[PDB]
Design a protein around this nucleic acid. Sequence first.
DNA 1: ATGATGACGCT
DNA 2: AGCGTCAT
Length: 430
Amino acid sequence: GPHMATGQDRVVALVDMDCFFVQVEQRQNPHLRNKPCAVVQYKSWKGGGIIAVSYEARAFGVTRSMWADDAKKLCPDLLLAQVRESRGKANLTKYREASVEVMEIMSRFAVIERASIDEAYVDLTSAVQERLQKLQGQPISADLLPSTYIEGLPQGPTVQKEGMRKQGLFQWLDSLQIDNLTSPDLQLTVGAVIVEEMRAAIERETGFQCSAGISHNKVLAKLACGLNKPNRQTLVSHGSVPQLFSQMPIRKIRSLGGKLGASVIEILGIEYMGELTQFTESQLQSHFGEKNGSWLYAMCRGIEHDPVKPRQLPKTIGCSKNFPGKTALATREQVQWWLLQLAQELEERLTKDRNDNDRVATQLVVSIRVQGDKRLSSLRRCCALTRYDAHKMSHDAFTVIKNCNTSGIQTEWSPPLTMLFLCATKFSAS
DNA sequence: ATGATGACGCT
DNA sequence: AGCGTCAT
Ligand SMILES: Nc1ccn([C@@H]2O[C@H](COP(=O)(O)OP(=O)(O)OP(=O)(O)O)[C@@H](O)[C@@H]2O)c(=O)n1
Ligand SMILES: [Ca+2]
Ligand SMILES: [K+]
C-alpha cells in the first residue's frame, strides 16, 4: 500500500537511430534514399555480408547476416553500400564519427549514457521538473507530441495507423492531471515533449531519423522504443505494464534474450514477463541467484533501478579480424603481418582519441581464436600499453601470444589462427 | 564463411 | 586476471 515502491521516481528515455549504418550511407549518397538498400562488408565471398538493412528492403525479407548474393534473390533491385576497407580489414570510422554527431546533440539536452554506436539513455527527471515549472499548469497540446504513441491506448467504448495514434494520444491527454507536479504520468508526458524536441534537433542537424522510448527506467524505455519504429516514439506508463507484460515473451526484455531467459522459461514453465509476478522474491532468488532474482521480482512489476550512467565515450577501443575456414593464419609471418595491420588501425584511432578526449589507454588486451574451438575467444592476455606505436603494440601482442604455437617448426603456426583481436583499455586522464 | 565491434558479471 | 554472457 502506502510503503510499496512503484518505480516511478525517474523519467528515462532511450534514443535509437533507425537503420543507422544505412542512414549514414544514404545521407552521403542521395541515390540510396527512399530505396531498398543495405550495407555490406567484404564482397568476394558470396557478395559480402549484409550488416544493416533499410526498412524498404526489410519488406522483402532482407536481414542482417544474409549474404548479399542471397539478399539479391529476395530483392533483385537491392542497392548496396560497402563498408570502407583499410589495411585489409573493414573500417567502421564513418559510423563512429556519425555516432559522435548524434551523441553531441543529445548531450545538449541531458547527460547521456552511450549504450552503443547508435543508442543512448537519457535521465530526464531534472529537465522535466524544470519544464513543468516553465509550464505552471497549462495543459500539454497534442501538437507538442506529433510522433508519440501512448502504449495501451486507445481503449474502451478509424482504420488507419495515424488515426489510432491520435485517438490514443487524445485519451491519454484528456485523462492527465496537469495540476499535480509530482504526477508520474504528467512527468512522462513532459519527458515525451522533450524527446520530441531532441529528436527534431537530431534530424535537423544531421539528417538522421530515430525512434525513442520514454518510461521510468532503462528496460521499459528500451522496450517502448521498439514498439513503434521507424521515426516514432512511444511512452510506456507504469499503468500500462500489466497488460503489456501479460503477453510479452520473456526474451524481449533486455538481459533475458539469452541463456538466463531460456532458463526462466524452462525452470518456471512460463512464457510471458507478467507470469513472473506469481513467484516470491525468495523463489526467484533460489532459481536465478540473489541479484537476478531481486531484479526479476522488481522488473516484472515494471520496476528497475539501473541508473543512467554519465558516460558519453566508449570505454575501450578495439580492432578485430576473423580468418575463417581456408584463410586461417598458418605461418608466423602471416600472424605478424595481421597483428601489425590491426595495430596500425588501433594506433590511428588511439591518437585521434587522445587529441579529442584528453585521455590515454594504459592496457593492451590481445585475444585470439585457434581453429577447432567453438568459443569465440580461445586466449586473452594483457600487457602494458606504454606508447601509441603500432610496431611496438604488434610486437608485444606477438610476445604475449607466441607460446600458443603448437608447431615444432619455428616458421609454422599450428593450430592456425581464425581470429585476432587488439583492444586498448584502462584509460587515464591526460 | 557472419563480422566487427562494445559493456559488464563471475571467480 | 582471464573467461563468459548479452548486446549493437
Ligand atoms: N549485429 C549487429 C547489430 C548492429 N550493428 C550495427 O549497429 C547499428 C545499429 O544496430 P541496431 O540498432 O541493432 O539496428 P539498426 O540498423 O539501427 O536498425 P533499427 O534499429 O531496427 O532501425 C546498425 O545500423 C549496424 O548494423 C552491427 O553491425 N551488427
Ligand atoms: Ca538502431
Ligand atoms: K541500436
